[PDB]
Amino acid sequence: MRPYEIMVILDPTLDERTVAPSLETFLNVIRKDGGTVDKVDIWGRRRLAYEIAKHAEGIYAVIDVKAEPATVSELDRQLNLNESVLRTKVLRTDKH
Amino acid sequence: ALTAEQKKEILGQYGLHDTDTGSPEAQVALLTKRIQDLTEHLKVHKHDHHSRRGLLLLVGRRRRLLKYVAQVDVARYRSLIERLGLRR
Amino acid sequence: AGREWRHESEPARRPGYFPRPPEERRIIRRKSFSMVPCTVDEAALEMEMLDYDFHLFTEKGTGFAAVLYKGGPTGYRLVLVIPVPADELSPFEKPITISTHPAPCLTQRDAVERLGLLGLPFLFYIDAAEGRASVIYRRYDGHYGLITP
Amino acid sequence: GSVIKKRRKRMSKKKHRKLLRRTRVQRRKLG
Amino acid sequence: KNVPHGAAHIKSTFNNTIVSITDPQGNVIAWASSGHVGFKGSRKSTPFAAQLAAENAARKAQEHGVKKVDVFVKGPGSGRETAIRSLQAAGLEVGTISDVTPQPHNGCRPPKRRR
Amino acid sequence: TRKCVFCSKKGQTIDYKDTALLRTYISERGKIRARRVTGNCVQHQRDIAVAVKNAREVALLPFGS
Amino acid sequence: GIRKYKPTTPGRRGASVSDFAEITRSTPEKSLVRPLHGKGGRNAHGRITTRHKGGGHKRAYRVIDFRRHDKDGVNAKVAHIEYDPNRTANIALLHYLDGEKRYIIAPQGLKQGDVIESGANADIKPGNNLPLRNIPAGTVIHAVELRPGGGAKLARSAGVSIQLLGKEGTYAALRMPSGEIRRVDVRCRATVGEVGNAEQSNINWGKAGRMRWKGKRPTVRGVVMNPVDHPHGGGEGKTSGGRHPVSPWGKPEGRTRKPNKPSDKLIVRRRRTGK
RNA sequence: GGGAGACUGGAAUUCCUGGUGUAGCGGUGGAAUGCGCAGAUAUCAGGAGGAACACCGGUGGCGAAGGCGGGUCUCUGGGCAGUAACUGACGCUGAGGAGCGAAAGCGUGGGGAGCGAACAGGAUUAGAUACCCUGGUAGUCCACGCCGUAAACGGUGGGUACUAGGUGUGGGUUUCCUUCCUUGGGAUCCGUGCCGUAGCUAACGCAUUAAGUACCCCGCCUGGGGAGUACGGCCGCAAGG
């Protein structure tokens, strides 16, 4: 179980009041995999430096997870598959 | 390489006493475990030649240690070979 | 262009100022000599003994900031913050002409960029933040000389 | 050292390579 | 048409200069080239040819209702200096100067060196 | 010369999230400033470059504005 | 993979055979097999319409489910992978959770014991079937329909895949295996992933016997024919036909697609040759 | 920037589509082939695709060598420092042998934007099978395999001990100026440069990273051509080694 930091940018059209619950469900799998701990922070509706997928503004979410690499990869695959997620980026908050 | 717990368990099972870590039996056991792990890795990545060179170095060191053991005490060499499955 | 050197190879074009590339160019000369109102002839005399090609003053009739410079063989040239004809301009005897374009409004970095991409010996402009006149020239050490009120 | 020796060696090697190119098919038919 | 405010695109290569005045939505309304003002061959790489082309483009934009323009220079320096000076000198007010040169992030292989 | 503000006892950690700490290290054209003009040590210069590139990848800094 | 025969006999010199590694069972499902008899290339009049057909090993037909539209929301488990003689691809046997068995062409990488789901709520793992509206752009699909309900028609061969470029309005632009770009309605279902048995095309058949077993009669060249039989026939000694190449019925070479077909409006750009 | 795998980011080139838009564009020492007038170049918007990763970026890091930098994740090798707990000479070298081995090249299957052997024209020339210009196929790219060569060079085999120093720079430990911020300075271990003693050399030069003083092991040389060629043999699909 290693710590990870996932930064996601979502399209601005969807309402912000649904970002926190919906993202919650996206973590449910990694919650039920191996007893993992999550910390979700949301600072969204910020204009991007460059246009991403015909969009200028985006919602930024930061998720601090402590989980197995396979679980994090599976979660990243699901997040990329979703059509309401413009981009994702996974970092390791360890020495790496 | 191996984690601390695997090294501890290998040393406890193969070490002559509860403290030694550089005894040729313990070194041979650790090298054999590392060799099997590296072989399992290389069965997937066939083109990782650098780790293959590292494996060759480990194999040579294990062979030299077995040579030293067989030169010092034959019975210990036979016991170690039969216990580790080490062909030679 | 630069590789290899021969006897007849074109000599490198060197500006009068020391290079001092954009890296640590800076602005380390800020004169504010005179802003007492003057006429064209008085401004020309203040030019001549200062041995400076251009000079920034404030005009008598307009009350506006202006810059005079040598207009080459045409004589002298006068540039104002807002272009006005000669009649409003205070009477003069030197043969000069007035630049029809107005001094534009732009920032410090934009002014440096315009000076670099336009290659003029100076740029006269109304500063965006200050809202007043300013003349930037490349100095004799490679820095930019920003003359402010 | 001087490149004269290298010039001699490259000339010899070049001539041998040209000869091999000229007689490739004959060597194949006799070999 | 009547477009009071537009942009100026100057492409100064090593052997030609092309000046185009553009309605800011990106639509070219009047363009003059170095070879369009009577030059041909190496003669059109000179700064004087750039001056003539810039003046011609300035007039061909001025009679179309263009008053104030902002310039986007581009290309290795051949006549950019004289191009902007001539754009100003033909009665066309210059708003801003921007150097937008396509700068690759080390992409594509350049042609082999000449000798 | 200049001081590696990170080797000091008050050296803030280098991250790709805090955008101001990186904006103070890139030129007005968005390019990464050289090491000599900054003065930081080689490890901190490399960390700064990596953070700048990551922030560019996550659309936090312009790609040469 | 591919297993190469040793050159023991002149008929086995360069021959090679498909290594049936993915096949997990040697028999088909008895309830999904229908009778099949060879036609010989002869139509309802008994006349030969397609030449070079006839003979060949007897084969049976396994009912393939090209219209997976009923079991939406019902998961299936891949029970076996079998060999279908009527197609180049291999077929997989599904066990739906309700108790129904079906046949589908096995996609690339599908393994025994995998879970196959379908419908709008399905995942994007290989083998899942879902309408093109729910499939994100850029993915690779196969067994694509042409009309909303007609069943899979495109990208059914072995190792063949279709790249979904993008969706606009009610139409999705697909890149066919031929390289041709076509639009199709978004209601058409598609299956995710490439088709398996991609290495099948590298088979060297060795001898005429293998082709005869596959059901291919020998093909006679036109220049060795007589002028009554072929336009290229006749002449003393070997010849090139003495005339621009033509079909045995005289139609000259060139484009034969009938112009102004109703489907011409749905084609973005045709395939290209010699580029 | 040690290696492998997977996913992915932006600038730029090319092409396609749609606007604005005209008569040139392109190229050179100078021009002409060439592109365009059927709407080129230029400018804007959208789309597709391939390759390489500007700034950081250097005589700086890693690797036995070849060599290795867009970002993130997974797996993995080596090195250095300190403590010195542990084994107790287990070390060095290594004929043959095995493995790795730039680029080019070969085989099967893909991909193909830019560059580009071959090949076409244009130009220069007395002649141009070239240098320069316009096009351009293999190839450069990916997967699995072959070959086994380079100015594969530091033209300097591996290990060890000793022999004045001075000054850059990378990594790690610690004492004293002490603000303890500061390349403060000192000490020490491991790298990587420059200058210079003794010493060595035919000289140039090397000089604690020896080409100095010595010990252990291996490879290689015995005038230049003929020739790394012929014959024979081994390997290789072939080129060839």
Asked whether the beta carbons of F26 and F33 are under 8 A apart, the reply is yes
Q: Which residue is nearest to nucleotide H19 (CA to C1')?
A: E27
The answer to whether the CB atoms of C117 and E96 lie below 8 A apart is no
Residues with Cβ within 8 Å of A79's Cβ and at least 6 positions away in sequence, in order, are: A6, A8, A26, A85, A88
List of long-range contacts for C84-91, beta carbons under 8 Å, 24+ apart: C88/C61, C88/C62, C89/C40, C89/C59, C89/C61, C89/C62, C90/C39, C90/C40, C90/C59, C90/C60, C90/C61, C91/C39
CATH architecture of F11-65: Irregular (4.10)
- In order of F2, F10, F12, F18, the CA distances from F38 in angstroms are 7, 17, 16, 19
Task: Taking each helix axis as running N to C, give the angle between helix B49-72 and helix B24-42, from 0 to 180 degrees, rounded to the nearest 10.
Answer: 150
Torsion of CA B78, B81, B84, B87, to 10 degrees: -150
Asked whether the beta carbons of G196 and G108 are under 8 A apart, the reply is yes
Helix (H, G, I), strand (E, B) or coil at E84: helix
CA distance linking residue D1 with residue D9, whole number of Å: 14
DSSP character at residue E94: E
Q: Where are the domains of chain F?
A: 11-65
CA distance linking residue G190 with residue G162, whole number of Å: 10
Helix (H, G, I), strand (E, B) or coil at D31: coil
Closest chain G residue to the Cα of A74, Cα to Cα? G125
CA distance linking residue G89 with residue G198, whole number of Å: 8
| Amino acid occupying residue C53 | D
Sort residue G149 into left (φ over 0), alpha (ψ -120 to 50) or beta. Answer: left
Question: What domain count does chain B have?
Answer: 1
Residues with Cβ within 8 Å of C87's Cβ and at least 6 positions away in sequence, in order, are: none
Task: Taking each helix axis as running N to C, give the angle between helix E47-62 and helix E80-89, from 0 to 180 degrees, rounded to the nearest 10.
Answer: 30
The answer to whether the CB atoms of F58 and A87 lie below 8 A apart is yes
Q: Do β-strands A57-67 and C96-98 pair in parallel, antiparallel, or remain unpaired?
A: unpaired
Asked whether the beta carbons of G121 and G133 are under 8 A apart, the reply is no
Show residues of chain F in contact with A58, CB under 8 Å: 59
Q: Are G168 and G109 part of one and the same domain?
A: no
Asked whether the beta carbons of C137 and C122 are under 8 A apart, the reply is yes
CA distance linking residue E62 with residue E57, whole number of Å: 8
Residues with Cβ within 8 Å of G44's Cβ and at least 6 positions away in sequence, in order, are: none
DSSP character at residue C10: P
CA distance linking residue B26 with residue B31, whole number of Å: 9
CA distance linking residue E88 with residue E70, whole number of Å: 10
The answer to whether the CB atoms of F37 and C109 lie below 8 A apart is no
CA distance linking residue C48 with residue E15, whole number of Å: 42
Which of C102, C110, C117 shows the shortest C-beta gap to E73?
C117
Residues with Cβ within 8 Å of A17's Cβ and at least 6 positions away in sequence, in order, are: none
Residues with Cβ within 8 Å of C66's Cβ and at least 6 positions away in sequence, in order, are: C43, C56, C57, C58, C59, C78, C79, C80, C81
Q: Are G85 and G99 part of one and the same domain?
A: yes
Task: Taking each helix axis as running N to C, give the angle between helix A19-34 and helix A69-81, from 0 to 180 degrees, rounded to the nearest 10.
Answer: 150
CA distance linking residue G107 with residue G91, whole number of Å: 8
| Amino acid occupying residue G45 | H
Q: What is the secondary structure of A62-78 as a DSSP string?
A: EEEEEE-HHHHHHHHHH
Write out the two tokens for A4.
């990870």
**In the 3-class helix/strand/coil scheme, how is G42-96 assigned residue by residue?**
ECCCCCECCCCCCCCCCCCEECCCCCCCCCCCCCEEEEEEECCCCCCCCEEEEEE
Asked whether the beta carbons of A38 and A30 are under 8 A apart, the reply is yes
| Number of Cβ atoms within 10 Å of the Cβ of E22 | 20
CA distance linking residue A65 with residue G96, whole number of Å: 36
Backbone φ and ψ of C78, nearest 5°: -120, 130
CA distance linking residue B57 with residue B78, whole number of Å: 23
Burial bucket for residue E17 (CB in 10 Å: 0-12, 13-18, 19+): buried
Q: What is the secondary structure of chain B as a DSSP string?
A: ---HHHHHHHHHHH-SSSS-SSSHHHHHHHHHHHHHHHHHHHTT-TT-HHHHHHHHHHHHHHHHHHHHHHHH-HHHHHHHHHHH----
Domain that holds residue B44: 1-88
Maximum pairwise Cα distance, chain G = 72
CA distance linking residue C69 with residue A58, whole number of Å: 52
Q: Which of G117, G121, G124 to mutate to test the interface with A (most CBs of A within 10 A)?
A: G124
Instruction: Flag whether D touches E (3+ CB pairs, 8 A cutoff).
Output: no
CA distance linking residue C142 with residue C129, whole number of Å: 25
Write out the two tokens for G125.
């793992």
Torsion of CA C13, C18, C23, C29, to 10 degrees: -140
Helix (H, G, I), strand (E, B) or coil at A53: coil
Q: Which residues pair with G185 in a beta bridge?
A: G171
- In order of B61, C35, G231, the CA distances from G238 in angstroms are 73, 105, 15
The answer to whether the CB atoms of G124 and A83 lie below 8 A apart is no
CA distance linking residue E41 with residue C103, whole number of Å: 38
Q: Which residues pair with A9 in a beta bridge?
A: A60, A87
For the domain that residue E104 is a member of, what is the CATH number? 3.30.420.80
> G91: closest CA among G151, G149, G143, G41?
G143
Residues with Cβ within 8 Å of E29's Cβ and at least 6 positions away in sequence, in order, are: E1, E3, E6, E21, E22, E23, E61, E64, E66
Backbone φ and ψ of C38, nearest 5°: -140, 165
Buried b / exposed e along G18-50 (16+ C-beta atoms within 10 A)? beeebebeeebbeebeeeeeeeeeeeeeeeeee
> F55: closest CA among F11, F10, F12, F25?
F25
Sort residue F37 into left (φ over 0), alpha (ψ -120 to 50) or beta. Answer: alpha
CA distance linking residue C66 with residue G54, whole number of Å: 101
Q: Do β-strands G91-96 and A57-67 pair in parallel, antiparallel, or remain unpaired?
A: unpaired
Residue tagged 């040598």 (tokens): C70
Question: What domain count does chain G have?
Answer: 3
CA distance linking residue B28 with residue B88, whole number of Å: 12
Strand residue runs (E) in chain D: none
Residues with Cβ within 8 Å of G145's Cβ and at least 6 positions away in sequence, in order, are: G151, G152, G153, G154, G184, G188, G189, G190
Q: What is the secondary structure of chain G as a DSSP string?
A: -EEEPPSSSGGGSS-EEE---S---SS--GGGEE-----TTB-TTS-B-SSS--------EE-------S-TT--EEEEEEE--TTSSS-EEEEEETTS-EEEEEPBTT--TT-EE-BSTT--SSTT-EEETTTSPTT-EEESEESSTTS-EEES-STT--EEEEEEETTEEEEE-TTS-EEEEETTSEEEES-BS-GGGGG----SHHHHHHHT------STTS-TTT-TT---SSS---SS--B-TT-PBSS--SPTT-GGGGGEEE------
Q: Which residues pair with C122 in a beta bridge?
A: C137
> G153: closest CA among G190, G121, G179, G185?
G190
Write out the two tokens for B25.
């039996």
For chain B, the first-to-last Cα distance in angstroms comes to 24
> C115: closest CA among C136, C146, C91?
C136
| Amino acid occupying residue G48 | I
Asked whether the beta carbons of E78 and E45 are under 8 A apart, the reply is yes
List of long-range contacts for E100-104, beta carbons under 8 Å, 24+ apart: E100/E72, E100/E73, E100/E74, E101/E73, E101/E74, E101/E75, E102/E74, E103/F64
CB-contacted nucleotides of strand H (7 Å)? 1-5, 7, 9-13, 19-32, 40-48, 50-58, 60, 63-65, 70-78, 85-87, 90-91, 99-101, 108-109, 113-116, 131-133, 144-145, 151, 155, 170-171, 180-183, 225-230, 239-240
CA distance linking residue C27 with residue C135, whole number of Å: 12
CA distance linking residue C59 with residue A33, whole number of Å: 80
Asked whether the beta carbons of G40 and G232 are under 8 A apart, the reply is no
Closest chain E residue to the Cα of C4, Cα to Cα? E115
Asked whether the beta carbons of E1 and E72 are under 8 A apart, the reply is no
Write out the two tokens for B56.
């060759």
Q: What is the secondary structure of C39-88 as a DSSP string?
A: -HHHHHHHHHHHT-SEEEEEBTTT-SEEEEEE-GGG-EEEEESS---TTT
User: H/E element holding C146?
Assistant: strand C144-147
Give the CA count within 13 Å in the CB-facing half-sphere of G267: 13
Q: Which residues pair with C59 in a beta bridge?
A: C38
Asked whether the beta carbons of E57 and E32 are under 8 A apart, the reply is yes
CA distance linking residue E18 with residue F25, whole number of Å: 37
Nucleotide whose C1' lies closest to the alpha carbon of residue E14: H27
CA distance linking residue D18 with residue G218, whole number of Å: 48
Residues with Cβ within 8 Å of E24's Cβ and at least 6 positions away in sequence, in order, are: E5, E6, E7
User: H/E element holding C144?
Assistant: strand C144-147
Asked whether the beta carbons of C98 and C88 are under 8 A apart, the reply is no
DSSP character at residue C138: E
Show residues of chain A in contact with F63, CB under 8 Å: 49-50
Q: Which of F14, F15, F17, F57 to mutate to test the interface with A (most CBs of A within 10 A)?
A: F17
Report chain breaks in chain E, C–N > 2.5 Å, as residues after which they occur: none
CA distance linking residue C102 with residue C65, whole number of Å: 12
CA distance linking residue E11 with residue E29, whole number of Å: 16
Q: Are G50 and G83 part of one and the same domain?
A: yes
Distance G108 CA to H138 C1' (A): 33
Distance E1 CA to H86 C1' (A): 93
State this model's resolution in angstroms.
3.5
User: H/E element holding C116?
Assistant: helix C108-118
Asked whether the beta carbons of G143 and G130 are under 8 A apart, the reply is no
Torsion of CA F12, F17, F23, F24, to 10 degrees: -10
Domain that holds residue A53: 1-96
Asked whether the beta carbons of C89 and C97 are under 8 A apart, the reply is no
CA–centroid distance for G225 within its chain: 33
> A85: closest CA among A66, A59, A49, A48?
A59
Asked whether the beta carbons of A60 and A44 are under 8 A apart, the reply is yes
Question: What domain count does chain A have?
Answer: 1
Query: What's the angle, vertex CA C48, arms to CA C46 and CA C53, rounded to 5?
Result: 100
The sign of the dihedral angle between the CA atoms of B79, B85, B87, B88 is negative
- In order of E2, G2, G7, the CA distances from G15 in angstroms are 77, 11, 8
| Number of Cβ atoms within 10 Å of the Cβ of E61 | 27
CA distance linking residue B14 with residue A69, whole number of Å: 32
The answer to whether the CB atoms of F59 and A9 lie below 8 A apart is yes
- How were these coordinates obtained? cryo-EM
Write out the two tokens for B70.
């067989």
Q: What is the secondary structure of E16-81 as a DSSP string?
A: -EEEEEEETTTEEEEEEEGGGGT--GGGGGSHHHHHHHHHHHHHHHHTTT--EEEEEEESSSSSHH
Asked whether the beta carbons of G1 and G19 are under 8 A apart, the reply is yes
Helix (H, G, I), strand (E, B) or coil at C133: strand
DSSP character at residue C3: S
Write out the two tokens for F6.
């990170």
Show residues of chain E in contact with C114, CB under 8 Å: 96-97
For chain A, the first-to-last Cα distance in angstroms comes to 15
Asked whether the beta carbons of A61 and A10 are under 8 A apart, the reply is yes
Residues with Cβ within 8 Å of G153's Cβ and at least 6 positions away in sequence, in order, are: G144, G145, G146
Domain that holds residue G20: 1-114
CA distance linking residue A73 with residue C84, whole number of Å: 70
Task: Taking each helix axis as running N to C, give the angle between helix B74-84 and helix B49-72, from 0 to 180 degrees, rounded to the nearest 10.
Answer: 140
For the domain that residue B15 is a member of, what is the CATH number? 1.10.287.10
